[PDB]
Motif scaffolding. Structure first.
Motif, PDB file in Angstrom:
ATOM      1  N   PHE A 153      -2.194  -0.424  -3.181  1.00 13.40           N
ATOM      2  CA  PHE A 153      -1.352   0.133  -4.150  1.00 13.40           C
ATOM      3  C   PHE A 153      -2.444  -0.171  -5.492  1.00 13.40           C
ATOM      4  N   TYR A 154      -2.460  -0.952  -5.618  1.00 14.61           N
ATOM      5  CA  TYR A 154      -4.033  -1.906  -6.641  1.00 14.61           C
ATOM      6  C   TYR A 154      -5.002  -0.690  -6.903  1.00 14.61           C
ATOM      7  N   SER A 155      -4.974  -0.016  -5.567  1.00 12.71           N
ATOM      8  CA  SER A 155      -6.879   0.747  -5.522  1.00 12.71           C
ATOM      9  C   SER A 155      -7.191   2.081  -6.540  1.00 12.71           C
TER      10      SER A 155
ATOM     11  N   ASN B 271      10.133  -8.117  -5.514  1.00 11.35           N
ATOM     12  CA  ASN B 271       9.792  -7.917  -4.230  1.00 11.35           C
ATOM     13  C   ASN B 271       8.247  -7.891  -3.748  1.00 11.35           C
ATOM     14  N   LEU B 272       7.951  -7.139  -3.963  1.00 13.50           N
ATOM     15  CA  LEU B 272       6.745  -6.355  -3.942  1.00 13.50           C
ATOM     16  C   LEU B 272       5.468  -7.090  -3.981  1.00 13.50           C
ATOM     17  N   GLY B 273       5.627  -7.713  -5.641  1.00 11.13           N
ATOM     18  CA  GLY B 273       4.981  -9.105  -5.858  1.00 11.13           C
ATOM     19  C   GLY B 273       4.724  -9.683  -5.326  1.00 11.13           C
TER      20      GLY B 273
ATOM     21  N   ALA C  33      12.013   4.141 -12.735  1.00 12.14           N
ATOM     22  CA  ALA C  33      10.242   4.849 -12.316  1.00 12.14           C
ATOM     23  C   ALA C  33       9.570   3.274 -13.377  1.00 12.14           C
ATOM     24  N   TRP C  34       8.801   3.278 -12.753  1.00 14.90           N
ATOM     25  CA  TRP C  34       7.913   2.102 -13.060  1.00 14.90           C
ATOM     26  C   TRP C  34       6.720   2.762 -13.162  1.00 14.90           C
ATOM     27  N   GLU C  35       6.077   1.537 -14.708  1.00 11.14           N
ATOM     28  CA  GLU C  35       4.699   2.587 -15.214  1.00 11.14           C
ATOM     29  C   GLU C  35       3.815   0.783 -15.814  1.00 11.14           C
TER      30      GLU C  35
ATOM     31  N   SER D 155      -1.864   6.318   2.983  1.00 12.69           N
ATOM     32  CA  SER D 155      -1.037   5.358   3.725  1.00 12.69           C
ATOM     33  C   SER D 155       0.067   4.496   3.552  1.00 12.69           C
ATOM     34  N   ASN D 156      -0.030   4.320   2.071  1.00 11.65           N
ATOM     35  CA  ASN D 156       1.407   3.563   1.448  1.00 11.65           C
ATOM     36  C   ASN D 156       2.931   4.624   1.793  1.00 11.65           C
ATOM     37  N   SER D 157       2.664   6.240   1.097  1.00 12.54           N
ATOM     38  CA  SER D 157       3.571   6.622   2.065  1.00 12.54           C
ATOM     39  C   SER D 157       3.427   7.303   3.300  1.00 12.54           C
TER      40      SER D 157
ATOM     41  N   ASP E   4       3.245   4.974   5.520  1.00 12.61           N
ATOM     42  CA  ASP E   4       4.309   3.869   5.644  1.00 12.61           C
ATOM     43  C   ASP E   4       5.873   3.660   5.368  1.00 12.61           C
ATOM     44  N   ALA E   5       5.856   4.496   4.283  1.00 11.65           N
ATOM     45  CA  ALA E   5       7.412   5.026   3.786  1.00 11.65           C
ATOM     46  C   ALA E   5       8.276   5.861   4.717  1.00 11.65           C
ATOM     47  N   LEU E   6       7.041   6.780   5.076  1.00  9.95           N
ATOM     48  CA  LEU E   6       8.067   7.553   5.826  1.00  9.95           C
ATOM     49  C   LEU E   6       7.790   7.405   7.505  1.00  9.95           C
TER      50      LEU E   6
ATOM     51  N   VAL F  32       3.066  12.559  -3.945  1.00 10.95           N
ATOM     52  CA  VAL F  32       4.607  12.797  -3.718  1.00 10.95           C
ATOM     53  C   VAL F  32       5.159  12.409  -1.994  1.00 10.95           C
ATOM     54  N   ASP F  33       6.030  11.467  -1.612  1.00 12.00           N
ATOM     55  CA  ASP F  33       6.344  11.439  -0.350  1.00 12.00           C
ATOM     56  C   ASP F  33       7.690  11.534  -0.421  1.00 12.00           C
ATOM     57  N   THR F  34       8.238  11.636   1.100  1.00 12.44           N
ATOM     58  CA  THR F  34       9.318  11.780   1.056  1.00 12.44           C
ATOM     59  C   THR F  34      10.391  10.677   1.798  1.00 12.44           C
ATOM     60  N   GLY F  35       9.459   9.337   1.382  1.00 10.78           N
ATOM     61  CA  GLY F  35       9.708   8.501   2.484  1.00 10.78           C
ATOM     62  C   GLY F  35      10.812   7.171   2.158  1.00 10.78           C
ATOM     63  N   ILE F  36      11.084   5.645   2.781  1.00 13.03           N
ATOM     64  CA  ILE F  36      12.172   5.284   2.358  1.00 13.03           C
ATOM     65  C   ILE F  36      12.338   5.366   0.601  1.00 13.03           C
ATOM     66  N   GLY F  37      11.165   5.122  -0.259  1.00 13.94           N
ATOM     67  CA  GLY F  37      11.754   5.133  -1.359  1.00 13.94           C
ATOM     68  C   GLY F  37      11.948   3.127  -2.275  1.00 13.94           C
ATOM     69  N   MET F  38      12.010   2.748  -3.383  1.00 14.85           N
ATOM     70  CA  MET F  38      12.080   1.264  -3.376  1.00 14.85           C
ATOM     71  C   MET F  38      13.112   1.482  -4.306  1.00 14.85           C
ATOM     72  N   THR F  39      13.115   0.287  -4.053  1.00 14.73           N
ATOM     73  CA  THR F  39      14.544  -0.541  -4.843  1.00 14.73           C
ATOM     74  C   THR F  39      14.147  -1.263  -6.442  1.00 14.73           C
TER      75      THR F  39
HETATM   76  C1  LIG Z   1       3.010  -4.396  -4.244  1.00 15.04           C
HETATM   77  O1  LIG Z   1       2.821  -2.949  -5.663  1.00 15.04           O
HETATM   78  C2  LIG Z   1       3.008  -2.205  -5.712  1.00 15.04           C
HETATM   79  C3  LIG Z   1       3.281  -1.583  -4.034  1.00 15.04           C
HETATM   80  C4  LIG Z   1       3.768   0.129  -3.545  1.00 15.04           C
HETATM   81  C5  LIG Z   1       3.103   0.211  -2.097  1.00 15.04           C
HETATM   82  C6  LIG Z   1       4.312   1.389  -1.317  1.00 15.04           C
HETATM   83  N1  LIG Z   1       5.458   0.037  -1.028  1.00 15.04           N
HETATM   84  C7  LIG Z   1       6.758   0.475  -0.261  1.00 15.04           C
HETATM   85  C8  LIG Z   1       7.611  -0.867  -0.462  1.00 15.04           C
HETATM   86  C9  LIG Z   1       8.680  -0.334   0.055  1.00 15.04           C
HETATM   87  C10 LIG Z   1       9.390   1.022   0.810  1.00 15.04           C
HETATM   88  C11 LIG Z   1       8.736   1.807  -0.018  1.00 15.04           C
HETATM   89  C12 LIG Z   1       7.350   1.606  -0.663  1.00 15.04           C
HETATM   90  C13 LIG Z   1       6.416   2.208  -0.944  1.00 15.04           C
HETATM   91  N2  LIG Z   1       6.056   3.857  -1.082  1.00 15.04           N
HETATM   92  C14 LIG Z   1       5.709   4.378  -1.313  1.00 15.04           C
HETATM   93  N3  LIG Z   1       5.092   5.272  -1.989  1.00 15.04           N
HETATM   94  N4  LIG Z   1       3.883   3.199  -2.057  1.00 15.04           N
HETATM   95  N5  LIG Z   1       4.961   2.180  -1.289  1.00 15.04           N
HETATM   96  C15 LIG Z   1       3.935   0.540  -4.110  1.00 15.04           C
HETATM   97  C16 LIG Z   1       4.042  -0.024  -5.709  1.00 15.04           C
HETATM   98  O2  LIG Z   1       4.831   1.059  -6.404  1.00 15.04           O
HETATM   99  C17 LIG Z   1       5.183   0.390  -8.146  1.00 15.04           C
HETATM  100  C18 LIG Z   1       4.083  -1.306  -6.352  1.00 15.04           C
END
Ligand SMILES: COc1cc(Cc2nc3ccccc3c3nc(N)nn23)cc(OC)c1
Ligand SMILES: COc1cc(Cc2nc3ccccc3c3nc(N)nn23)cc(OC)c1
Lengths: 207, 207
Positions: free
Chosen positions: A122-124, A90-92, A145-147, A34-36, A38-40, A76-83
């Motif tokens: 995601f945390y699932s 932001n995500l937190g 790389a996030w880990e 689902s997350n992939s 959404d990014a796509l 793996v997805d070819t979605g928008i990706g994350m900064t």
């Molecule tokens: C809340 O913590 C998270 C949540 C996600 C889900 C998530 N969030 C996004 C936000 C913006 C653009 C793309 C994505 C995104 N692509 C993917 N595959 N997951 N994803 C991914 C994540 O990766 C470290 C951490």
């Protein structure tokens, strides 16, 4: 390599996911797919007004890759990706309110499978993975790389692995008793059950 | 006032929604609330890197407004809103692939309630509405009114009504036999059933 503390509320959520007895673990896959998706959706929408956003790759798809030698399942997805800012801040920030709502719903009788309705699916991943590594590449930003193995901290570094073009790889380092999610039969079953109408091709790689 | 033809595939979808015997009409509301939630998610995310995007209004919420005198149910959000290009071109472009997938799933045994999984839930409005009017305002663009009673065409004009700040109002001009969706009891029931965990306040106005 930079080390960061999760916000208390997120650490608490991760502990709940890791500690609670809950047998229906297979839902992690639907949440990540689902997350992939959404990014796509996001890169597809952006490309309609700026076609050059697909210079990093035109194909919009999802790959599922099991590796028994590494005990990993990679989405793996070819979605928008994350900064970098997404990964660190932001995500937190967004996840804080969803976590609160989720943990309140759980106390009121909801169950863990409903996690996606709160935007924190995601945390699932921590239902089945002892460690999660995320490789991600957004247009006009570096590959990161996030880990995290939970325990209250995560790391972010610039990634020097194989360049990915654009998108996200979520690498699940599976717990010892969760290797069923490397089996072709089992992944196929779960995709059919919970992810059957995703609007992008999902390719399950064979070992 | 400009008049546009729907793509053939969208007109076909709208005809299916209008013509097919299907008693579970109440799902239109969940689909529109979901759409509002998605738009609210988008402006919230954008605001994290550009706070000035909320100069058009900080409150992120959904209002449900019934009007018996007009026979309308209006769903209002303060989400990101839609541009002229969204209304004329972009949304229809994205909807084409989802429509194809949906109509194929229906031939294979899926039902109309699954419309949202294909990203075309907006058109479920036509289960209960003879006409749908959409007023929308995106940052850095004008306020527009989109309107369609199906029949293969829609209109777009610049809106001269009350300025809305930012967001979208979907105005459902209800079919004569669908006035149950103006009743407080009925809306409350439907929100509780299908939209109980939306992460934004939903206010049901009283007549
Ligand atoms: C809340 O913590 C998270 C949540 C996600 C889900 C998530 N969030 C996004 C936000 C913006 C653009 C793309 C994505 C995104 N692509 C993917 N595959 N997951 N994803 C991914 C994540 O990766 C470290 C951490
Ligand atoms: C496919 O046809 C559609 C789909 C929609 C759903 C839709 N799409 C959006 C896209 C971008 C930004 C905001 C929104 C949006 N806000 C709301 N409330 N719906 N909505 C709305 C719509 O209004 C005329 C037509």
């Amino acid at each position: 390599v930079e080390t960061f503390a999760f916000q208390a509320e997120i650490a608490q959520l991760m502990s709940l996911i890791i500690n609670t007895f809950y047998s229906n673990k297979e839902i992690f896959l639907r949440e990540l797919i689902s997350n992939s998706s959404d990014a796509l959706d996001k890169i597809r929408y952006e490309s309609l007004t700026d076609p050059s956003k697909l210079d990093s790759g035109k194909e919009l798809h999802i790959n599922l890759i099991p590796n028994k030698q590494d005990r990993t399942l990679t989405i793996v997805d070819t979605g928008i990706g994350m900064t970098k800012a997404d990964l660190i801040n932001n995500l937190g920030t967004i996840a804080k309110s969803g976590t609160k709502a989720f943990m309140e719903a759980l106390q009121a009788g909801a169950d863990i499978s409903m996690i996606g309705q709160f935007g924190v699916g995601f945390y699932s991943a921590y239902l089945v993975a002892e460690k999660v590594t995320v490789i991600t590449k957004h247009n006009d930003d570096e590959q990161y790389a996030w880990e995290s193995s939970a325990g209250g901290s995560f790391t972010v570094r610039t990634d020097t692995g194989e360049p990915m073009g654009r998108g996200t790889k979520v690498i699940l380092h599976l717990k010892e008793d969760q290797t069923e999610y490397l089996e072709e039969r089992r992944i196929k079953e779960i995709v059919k059950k919970h992810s059957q109408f995703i609007g992008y091709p999902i390719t399950l790689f064979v070992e």
